[PDB]
Structure 1
Amino acid sequence: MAIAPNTRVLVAGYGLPAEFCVTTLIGMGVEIDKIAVATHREDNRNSGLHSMLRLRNIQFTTAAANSEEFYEFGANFAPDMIISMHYRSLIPGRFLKLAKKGSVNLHPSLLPAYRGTNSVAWVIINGESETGFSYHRMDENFDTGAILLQERISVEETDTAFSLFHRQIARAMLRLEEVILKLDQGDPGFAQLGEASYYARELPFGGVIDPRWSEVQIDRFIRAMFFPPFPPAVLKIDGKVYYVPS
């Protein structure tokens, strides 16, 4: 029902999912001096977070995940639990070991499907009618730890990377409190089950339409590349670049 009083929570996070997470923790009655945040520099997605951390005087670091300052920041805070909410770096194992209740990260697929990055794009490229999000404990690798909560999200024929990425955030937030409680209560989760799949760091197909693709493949790709303000899918014709309308 309620979080253990004096639970100390460290949020490794970036942007709106993180602002929402700190909001939620405060709503759960976690004291202000029992919240610590690790994040990245203030850019045009992290401005909401930063302003909140300054406004509420929430201790935070922007130091790199592999830096000694980051480890110190965690060590001095002594978290019971760590919540990764769109943090953008590999979190060292020795940092995760600081939280005796362990940790959780939000990943935008049904793990072990769509390990890697750009999951939302690839889901659409492969023509998935269904995807999901996975709140999972973190181990030393990305995308591999035990599942605390997974929920299905249906993929529509009109979805873009853009629409799906934002619905992922919105829907995942619904379950965040239950997840924070699962962590409070020591829920071990379950080992990720099923066949994995993996998709490389960089932008799918370099953003470039393959002319050999079927129309269905092209429609999917166009939508998967739609993500303002980034350029749309590129079609090359007579060795020359053209942005698609979408």
Structure 2
Amino acid sequence: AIAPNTRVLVAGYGLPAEFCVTTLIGMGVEIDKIAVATHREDNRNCGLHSMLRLRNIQFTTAAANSEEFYEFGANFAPDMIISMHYRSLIPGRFLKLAKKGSVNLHPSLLPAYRGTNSVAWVIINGESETGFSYHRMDENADTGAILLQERISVEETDTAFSLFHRQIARAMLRLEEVILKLDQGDPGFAQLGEASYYARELPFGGVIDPRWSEVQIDRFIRAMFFPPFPPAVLKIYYVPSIDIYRSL
């Protein structure tokens, strides 16, 4: 099992966090030993919210930088903090509340592909491999000792949509193991190699430059595929697949 009377704060959003809470209940962690920091109910975060309400699990939606959020942590007094797709930077003072520390899920092999749109940028740049990294957190983004990584092959037929969902699914299959490592106080290993980073913004503002090769265009199209967001644009109009691009 996990050490009894262990207190776990999950900071998270969506399925990953719903799945994490599920896993924790499965490892024996009591309800009063669990707490969730999240964001408001929306069309990705409804499962989490409906579970929090049904099972009466204490939670906050307060902003990560608010005194209300800090107090939610201090009143709970966690042993560990798990970040599952939490969308805001968690201040150092908050992370410091967790006496056994924390773990975040990042869908790249860090220090490669820090930032956001990792799954989109992996496809554009033509990577044959990506993966995910579970890592210990510090005050900074995507930094800290690696507890676990798994390599994910990128396919020629992958879109951002498919790679995003495979990222989640595969990452979940290693979560239990990761919580143990955190519980056992595994220090993990330092990040190393060639670090890269990519921004909030939508790659090339979602528009296809026609001076690119057919190979890069196809990749851009695939990386911009993410329903219900609009797909890539050509100018001459809307291009969700290479066939439709070949039709034009």
Unaligned runs of 5+ in 2: 241-248
Quote the residue 1:23 is aligned against: 22
Deviation of the 1:35 alpha carbon: 0.3
Deviation of the 1:105 alpha carbon: 0.3
Q: Aligned pair 1:215/2:214, yes or no?
A: yes
Q: How does 1:120-199 map to 2 (within 5 A)?
A: 120-199=119-198
Q: Return the alpha-carbon distance in structure 2 between the equivalents of residues 150 and 40 of structure 1.
A: 27
Which string of whole-angstrom CA distances, capped at 9 and with x for unpartnered residues, describes residues 23-59 of structure 1? 0000000000000000000000000000000000000
Q: Return the alpha-carbon distance in structure 1 between the equivalents of residues 120 and 41 of structure 2.
A: 25
Using structure 2 for the length normalisation, give the TM-score: 0.96
Q: Return the alpha-carbon distance in structure 2 between the equivalents of residues 47 and 84 of structure 1.
A: 18
Q: Return the alpha-carbon distance in structure 1 between the equivalents of residues 109 and 219 of structure 2.
A: 20
Q: Return the alpha-carbon distance in structure 1 between the equivalents of residues 207 and 66 of structure 2.
A: 36
Deviation of the 1:111 alpha carbon: 0.3
4+ runs deviating over 3 angstroms: none
Q: Return the alpha-carbon distance in structure 2 between the equivalents of residues 90 and 60 of structure 1.
A: 18
Bigger mean CA deviation after superposition, 218-227 or 193-202: 193-202
Deviation of the 1:212 alpha carbon: 1.4
Which string of whole-angstrom CA distances, capped at 9 and with x for unpartnered residues, describes residues 104-141 of structure 1? 00000000000000000000000001000000001111
Quote the residue 1:243 is aligned against: 238
SS of the aligned residue for 2:35 comes to strand
Which string of whole-angstrom CA distances, capped at 9 and with x for unpartnered residues, describes residues 206-227 of structure 1? 0111111111100000000000
Q: Return the alpha-carbon distance in structure 2 between the equivalents of residues 104 and 210 of structure 1.
A: 39
Quote the residue 1:58 is aligned against: 57
Q: Aligned pair 1:70/2:65, yes or no?
A: no
SS of the aligned residue for 2:53 comes to helix
Q: Return the alpha-carbon distance in structure 2 between the equivalents of residues 25 and 61 of structure 1.
A: 18
SS of the aligned residue for 1:20 comes to helix
Unaligned runs of 5+ in 1: none
Fraction of identical pairs, as percent: 99
Q: Return the alpha-carbon distance in structure 2 between the equivalents of residues 76 and 211 of structure 1.
A: 56
Q: Return the alpha-carbon distance in structure 2 between the equivalents of residues 205 and 25 of structure 1.
A: 40
Deviation of the 1:200 alpha carbon: 1.2
In the alignment of these two chains, the number of paired residues is 240
SS of the aligned residue for 2:234 comes to strand
Using structure 1 for the length normalisation, give the TM-score: 0.97
SS of the aligned residue for 2:226 comes to coil
Q: Aligned pair 1:37/2:32, yes or no?
A: no
Q: Return the alpha-carbon distance in structure 2 between the equivalents of residues 212 and 189 of structure 1.
A: 45
SS of the aligned residue for 1:236 comes to coil
Q: Return the alpha-carbon distance in structure 1 between the equivalents of residues 4 and 201 of structure 2.
A: 43
Q: Return the alpha-carbon distance in structure 1 between the equivalents of residues 233 and 81 of structure 2.
A: 40
Q: Return the alpha-carbon distance in structure 2 between the equivalents of residues 210 and 144 of structure 1.
A: 34
SS of the aligned residue for 1:95 comes to helix
